[PDB]
Amino acid sequence: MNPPPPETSNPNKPKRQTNQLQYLLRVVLKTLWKHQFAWPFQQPVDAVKLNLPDYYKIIKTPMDMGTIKKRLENNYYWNAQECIQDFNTMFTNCYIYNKPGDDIVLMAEALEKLFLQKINELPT
Ligand SMILES: Nc1cc(-n2ccnc2)c2c(F)ccc(O)c2n1
C-alpha cells in the first residue's frame, strides 16, 4: 500500500506569505511544472500504480511538486527556505531511490538545474 501523502495543511503550524514564497509558486514552481520532464514529480509517488513496491521501504521523507504546490497555495510555509528544502528533498529522494544515469534521474537532474537557475535570484 501507499503511505498517506505528506500534509498540505497543519493548524498547529503558523502560516506566512512572503514575496519570496509568492515567487516560488507563481514563477519557480509554475515554470518547472511545464517542463517536459515534470510529470513523474507532479504528485506523490504512487508505488502501487507505478509497480515500485520497494519505494517507501527506502524513502522515508517523500516529497513531490504536487505537495509543494498545495503547501504554497495553503501558505503552509513560514519562509522560502522551508519550501526550497522540500524541492531539495524531492530531488534527493530520486537520487537515493535510483542509480546514476537512470532515465528518471536524468529527468530530475534537468529539473534540478532549472530550479537552481530560477532561485539564483529571488525578489526582495
Ligand atoms: N525508478 C523510478 C520510476 C518511476 N516511474 C516512472 C514511470 N513509472 C515508474 C518514478 C517516478 F514516476 C517518480 C519518482 C521516481 O523516483 C521514480 N523512480
Specify the amino acid at residue 50. Answer: L
Method: X-ray
Final resolution, Å: 1.6
Residue nearest to atom 15 of ligand 1 (CA): 94
- Within a 13 Å sphere around the CA of 123, how many CA atoms are in the beta-carbon half? 12
Q: What cell does 34 get? A: 511545464
103 CA to centre of ligand 1 in angstroms: 9
| Residue 35: exposure state from Cβ atoms within 10 A (0-12, 13-18, ≥19) | middle
3-class DSSP assignment, residue 122: coil
Give the Cα separation of 4 and 95 in Å (integer).
22
Residues with CB under 6 A from ligand 1: 40, 45, 50, 52, 94, 97-98, 104
